[PDB]
Design a protein around this ligand. Sequence first.
Ligand code: CL7
Ligand SMILES: C=Cc1c(C)c2cc3nc(c4c5[nH]c(cc6nc(cc1[nH]2)C(C)=C6CC)c(C)c5C(=O)[C@@H]4C(=O)OC)[C@H](CCC(=O)OC/C=C(/C)CCC[C@H](C)CCC[C@H](C)CCCC(C)C)[C@@H]3C
Ligand SMILES: CC1=CCCC(C)(C)[C@H]1/C=C/C(C)=C/C=C/C(C)=C/C=C/C=C(C)/C=C/C=C(C)/C=C/C1=C(C)CCCC1(C)C
Ligand SMILES: CC1=CCCC(C)(C)[C@H]1/C=C/C(C)=C/C=C/C(C)=C/C=C/C=C(C)/C=C/C=C(C)/C=C/C1=C(C)CCCC1(C)C
Ligand SMILES: CC1=CCCC(C)(C)[C@H]1\C=C/C(C)=C/C=C/C(C)=C/C=C/C=C(C)/C=C/C=C(C)/C=C/C1=C(C)CCCC1(C)C
Ligand SMILES: [Fe+2]
Lengths: 34, 284, 59, 420, 30, 28, 37, 63, 31, 323, 65, 23
Amino acid sequence: MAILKFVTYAWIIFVISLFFFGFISSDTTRNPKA
Amino acid sequence: ASAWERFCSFITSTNNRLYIGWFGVLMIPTLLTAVTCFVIAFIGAPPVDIDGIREPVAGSLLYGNNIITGAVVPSSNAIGLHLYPIWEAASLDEWLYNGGPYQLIIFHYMIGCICYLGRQWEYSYRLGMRPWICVAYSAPLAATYSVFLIYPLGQGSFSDGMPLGISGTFNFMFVFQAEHNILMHPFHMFGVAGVLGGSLFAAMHGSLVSSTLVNSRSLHFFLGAWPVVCIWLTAMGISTMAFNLNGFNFNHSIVDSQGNVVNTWADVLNRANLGFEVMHERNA
Amino acid sequence: MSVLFQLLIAAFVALSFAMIIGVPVVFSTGDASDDANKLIWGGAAAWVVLLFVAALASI
Amino acid sequence: AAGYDRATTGYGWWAGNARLTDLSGQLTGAHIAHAGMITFWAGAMTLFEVSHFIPEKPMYEQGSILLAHLAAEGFGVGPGGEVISTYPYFVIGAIHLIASAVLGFGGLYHTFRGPAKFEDYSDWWGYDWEDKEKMMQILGIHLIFLGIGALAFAAKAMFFGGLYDPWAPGGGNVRLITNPTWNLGTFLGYITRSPWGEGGWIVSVNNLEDVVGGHLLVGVHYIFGGVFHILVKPWGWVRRAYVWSGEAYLSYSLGALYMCGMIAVGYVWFNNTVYPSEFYGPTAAEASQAQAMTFLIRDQRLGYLMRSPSGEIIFGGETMRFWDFRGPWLEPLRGPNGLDLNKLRNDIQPWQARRAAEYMTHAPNYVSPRSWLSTSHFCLAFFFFVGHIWHSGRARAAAAGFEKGIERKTEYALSLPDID
Amino acid sequence: IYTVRWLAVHTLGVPLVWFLGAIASMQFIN
Amino acid sequence: MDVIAYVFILACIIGLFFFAVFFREKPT
Amino acid sequence: KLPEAFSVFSPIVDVMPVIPLFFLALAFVWQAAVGFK
Amino acid sequence: SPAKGGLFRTGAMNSGDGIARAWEGHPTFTDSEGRELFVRRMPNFFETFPVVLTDKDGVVRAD
Amino acid sequence: VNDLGAIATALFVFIPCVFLILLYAQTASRG
Amino acid sequence: RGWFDVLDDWLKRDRFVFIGWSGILLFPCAFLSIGGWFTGTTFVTSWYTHGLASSYLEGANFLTVAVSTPADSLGHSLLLLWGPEAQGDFTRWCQLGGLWNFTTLHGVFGLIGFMLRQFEIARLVGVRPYNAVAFSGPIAVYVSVFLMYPLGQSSWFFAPSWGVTSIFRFLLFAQGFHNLTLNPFHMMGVAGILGGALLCAIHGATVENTLFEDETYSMVTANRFWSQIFGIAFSNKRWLHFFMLFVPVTGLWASAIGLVGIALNMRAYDFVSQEIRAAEDPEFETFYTKNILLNEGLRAWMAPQDQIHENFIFPEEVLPRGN
Amino acid sequence: SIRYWIIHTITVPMLFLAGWLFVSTGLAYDVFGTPRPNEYFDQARQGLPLVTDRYEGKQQIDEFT
Amino acid sequence: LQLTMLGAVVIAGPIVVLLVALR
Ligand code: CL7
Ligand SMILES: C=Cc1c(C)c2cc3nc(c4c5[nH]c(cc6nc(cc1[nH]2)C(C)=C6CC)c(C)c5C(=O)[C@@H]4C(=O)OC)[C@H](CCC(=O)OC/C=C(/C)CCC[C@H](C)CCC[C@H](C)CCCC(C)C)[C@@H]3C
Ligand SMILES: CC1=CCCC(C)(C)[C@H]1/C=C/C(C)=C/C=C/C(C)=C/C=C/C=C(C)/C=C/C=C(C)/C=C/C1=C(C)CCCC1(C)C
Ligand SMILES: CC1=CCCC(C)(C)[C@H]1/C=C/C(C)=C/C=C/C(C)=C/C=C/C=C(C)/C=C/C=C(C)/C=C/C1=C(C)CCCC1(C)C
Ligand SMILES: CC1=CCCC(C)(C)[C@H]1\C=C/C(C)=C/C=C/C(C)=C/C=C/C=C(C)/C=C/C=C(C)/C=C/C1=C(C)CCCC1(C)C
Ligand SMILES: [Fe+2]
């Protein structure tokens, strides 16, 4: 239980951070025309 | 070639078999969680006290049901809108008994759906095309959010949400009709017109193209727009009915000059609703 | 002065409607600006003055 | 005329406003006129509802929503949710109508008479979308105005009449808040509260001290943030993580407005403190619990509770779904673990017993103000989410350059290696 | 001048107008 | 035993999805 | 109920709330004048 | 009746209500007052019917 | 349940499936 | 050039509308059906067949007017204006419900005329008449619902009365008595209709969002987009549009077979194992069982007034309730 | 243009009034058998006039009439 | 009763349109 809760929270934070830093990492330069 | 840059170039790359993207980063775990829990809880899962009355209702395959009658029962009436995580449960068997799997599935599924819409936009961007597939996809998204999230919020508990099953859907439809008379709500009439007209226009367009192929752009625009607009309207109708803003009511409308009441079809419809409702409402 | 007050508000409504009709035409087409600009700005000034007068005339 | 046709702009009449993207003066005129529309609606509806007001019937039975907002702020109300005189409502409506007149005049003036593009007249008022510093400064100024507004609301609650506190003794009463909450632990506990039924995110505020302190805190922050925006440049990463055009800013605003609309629906539907049940009527939880308690009162007069999942004392039946609901007429009959049966035996003061039935009748034929507000603003919020997606996608594509279609001879999909 | 289109237009309009009048009349019945 | 029939049909459907996704003949 | 001084103007207020709608309709009338160019 | 079956209720009719062997005889019902009432027969439509023993005059006696 | 229910389901699953697979195989063997 | 060739060329001549030979069957029949419905809603009442006020004279609303079905006692009589029932009396013909038969029969022949018209137009233009084959579905639905269903039942009285609330009554009646939602053919029909709407929506959106910057849209981009987003995609245009045609029509035909099945009470009303298992112990409760209970309640609460001719009298005691 | 305007002005309101009078003069109730608002029931004839026989329906209505 | 002011506003709008439309 405690392990499951910790793992879930860590996963959620990790995925959210991945999302955030991905979208701030100049993903306006990924279009074809660029 | 920073490790972070290499990772970003991996995810936001148009050479995978399935595009991942940043939205897909959230989409994949949530969808996998929802699918896994749905499969597990649909094959075998204990009976659930849907009414919050210590009396259970079973919905799994191993407990007797088949595909038509099986379902994933909504979380118990006693929980209300409370999130019920496993680690916030007294005991695993109890947590199943209150209907936690339903909550798990619907929450992961809704997050995955909205992230799937985002992923659609993202790949439309990465390929260099106008990014409005997601706008069209926003209609069925609105419908699911209506039945699974907004309606329970208006009703105060997830026990009023839609069951995840074929017969559970029909039971939901009949109880909804009983309590809100959805048929005589104009937005559902718009939705019915939307689906039937969408099928009509699809058949017409397909027949025309496949017959002659042996502003015309506005044709495809109208094809895309019509059912989407109607589904937006009917999703909004469901949402409004979630706040007790029920549809039309013409019961007891025509009265005889002396004072008697003459029946109309609306009274027959109301009596059918009465039957559905009195069979509902276990006690009073 | 109650009847005076009612008559004042009636005049206010009259002026306000007159400005409603005049302002788009005066502003959009500045072909008759010599008298039109005077008309519109004087109407605005009369509107402000009438509102301020009615402010006290209420009490 | 020139530039008002499809040929000279490229936009069909049904997208006419798009032509205004780079005409600063007329665009400003349109915004001012639209603000005039909003305040005109406010004043006109206030006057209508006052003209149709009826002192005997409650507001929620009478069917007024703009009046209930003023009643919550305490303009011309009394203890127990009773009006004293509908004059201040008339005052507010008239002021709004006059302001609408002035704003409409300004909007027409900038639309037609004044300069078409402020860039020609001056440079403080002449702005281009792709000037990041200018946009930062304008955002900062408007933030400062919002902060002044929030502090004004707090100042009213603390010095000028206050607010109708429905947790005052013996039913609600208009009060002046004197002990605002300012502990940061309380603020963090509010923010990091679960949005789920495990509490309530910010909708779960139940005392007016927290409301006033929160408005104080946010007004201070808004003024500070406005100053910061005026005084600094956008960071490099900020410049690289956004799109800088008019439509992009519109899309950001749409997203923010969609979020605010959903939160407002949550407030109006679950909150009985900042939306007093005396005016908007009982919430769904309040209605169910009042029905349960009135039936219990009748059954105890003529000679039903149960245990919570955590084991407290709660009502029985469907109403168990509202086991945690807290209310002013129900709070005095509380206990360390749920409302005690012994308390309900002899502690029901007359006004609470009257409120119970009065709420039982008006369960949200009859449609509560909460139903109107909730449905309307849920629909508005959903459509603003759709608009956010539309405009954000358009902004991203237009900035990239492939907005008007795929290029026939340089199509990008034709160059990618086949996956099979 | 009796074109097929004349027939069609009249076959539609005549009963249409008559019924509109009838329904209007019903609207003023107490 | 019905459960076995249902589960077998479902598993066959999932396998079909896997093959239809990763083994389709290349469009050209 | 209106202030007893203003009660005379009761009918006018009765048409105030629905005025904004006309504005929207007005747009098309404007676009009707220029012939949707 | 052929209008009392089902689409997936397979096999002969005797797989259903079973095979008949004997007719129990025509029954008649009487109440406390001795009045002779009759049971209303279930129409083809209803899968189940509410049992209602009514007076021949059209007044429901028992159920 | 019906003892023939499983048999009917199995034959329904199988016969069209083997038909389709046979057609595809004798198509793909050919160039 | 005999009279026949003159007539044929005259029919095929270009006008505002195309008449053709089919018009001789379509236009009079369609016009009569529409006029019958309008008259039945405007003036004729169902006070004598269903004991209802379903006309504007009665004071009904647009959502409550209906050309109600004939009485139950008539069985399946064709109710000709000169038949043994009406006997030439127009008023008795209207009161007995003959307008329902008038409207429905002329509607049948209007639909037949329309299908023939599409055949004729496709013959003139010289293209494959996939439109007629597509329209074959609506004819199947119409024939199954308005003719075969009341013919398999006791009387025309059980057919759908032409209206809005009357059709809603028909839907709820079908659920209560035939448990239609559990019928697999209706499930295929629902899947067909919803899939047709889905196909229309996504096809329109895709064609709009892969437009070339000038058929007219990048099929390659659309194919790649859907392959990498959803997994599968149409790489053939002809297949794409034939599928769009095929799905809703198939849904309609499956639903038609479902409706003809329930016309004979050959309905999938229950699952035997579930009924047995519920009989053994009362704790066993599933959603299907509660659907069964709802059907019982709807039957009991609707029968006394829906089928007024049967003089059903169910007391309060026998009416099912959630106690 | 102009010519047909005379004919339509003379005729269309006459047709409108034709329908109007057809309803107002109570002719429709006789034509279509639709009961007058007082004809649904007598002062106590609250029973429903439902046809029970196919063969003599018109005469049975005449009895109900 | 109240149709007078509503008609007045209906006159007010398109009249404002028309006065510009003359030039
Ligand atoms: C519904 C999704 C949506 C939202 C909420 C939204 N937009 Mg748009 N939007 C704009 C501003 C805007 C603002 C300032 C704003 C927020 O306040 C929004 N939008 C919001 C302009 C920049 C730009 C030009 C808009 C423009 O020039 O004209 C707008 C056009 C029309 C016909 C307005 C008439 C409205 C419809 C009849 C809807 C009826 C609703 C109803 C009356 C409510 C009452 C009920 C009633 C029944 C009683 C724009 C567009 C456009 C579109 C589209 C499709 C949208 N949008 C969509 C949205 C352009 O093509 C188009 C575009 O960009 O093409 C390039
Ligand atoms: C409610 C659903 C529904 C309606 C109303 C509808 C309507 C129509 N579809 C047509 C076509 C089609 N429909 C098609 C597929 C579909 N159609 C579907 C569902 C519908 N289709 C579905 C689900 C599909 C997908 C498979 C195709 C492929 C076509 C065509 O090609 C054709 C077309 O070209 O459309 C433009 C008709 C063209 C004109 C015509 O011949 O009228 C019908 C003709 C007659 C004679 C009508 C007679 C009177 C009717 C039968 C009874 C009386 C009705 C009253 C007057 C009004 C009743 C009001 C109600 C409230 C009861 C018409 C517009
Ligand atoms: C005032 C009030 C009255 C009642 C009492 C109460 C205590 C509740 C008091 C409330 C006080 C409160 C709750 C104060 C706190 C408010 C808070 C935490 C607001 C936070 C909002 C979070 C937001 C926007 C998230 C923003 C993230 C964004 C945009 C995305 C940014 C980025 C991404 C990933 C995409 C591209 C753009 C960019 C910048 C790179
Ligand atoms: C359209 C719509 C949407 C937007 C709002 C708006 C108010 C405009 C709304 C319009 C509403 C209105 C007022 C609609 C009016 C509709 C009507 C009544 C149209 C009716 C036309 C009447 C017709 C054909 C009747 C034809 C009758 C016929 C052949 C009779 C046939 C006969 C029968 C039935 C019995 C035997 C004898 C005979 C002669 C063969
Ligand atoms: C437009 C339209 C829609 C579909 C296309 C179609 C071609 C058919 C076309 C055809 C016809 C139609 C519907 C035309 C509609 C025209 C209308 C209603 C125009 C009306 C505009 C009304 C306006 C400005 C009113 C502004 C009122 C204001 C300021 C305030 C006034 C005042 C206030 C409330 C305080 C008291 C004093 C006073 C003066 C009364
Ligand atoms: Fe196409």
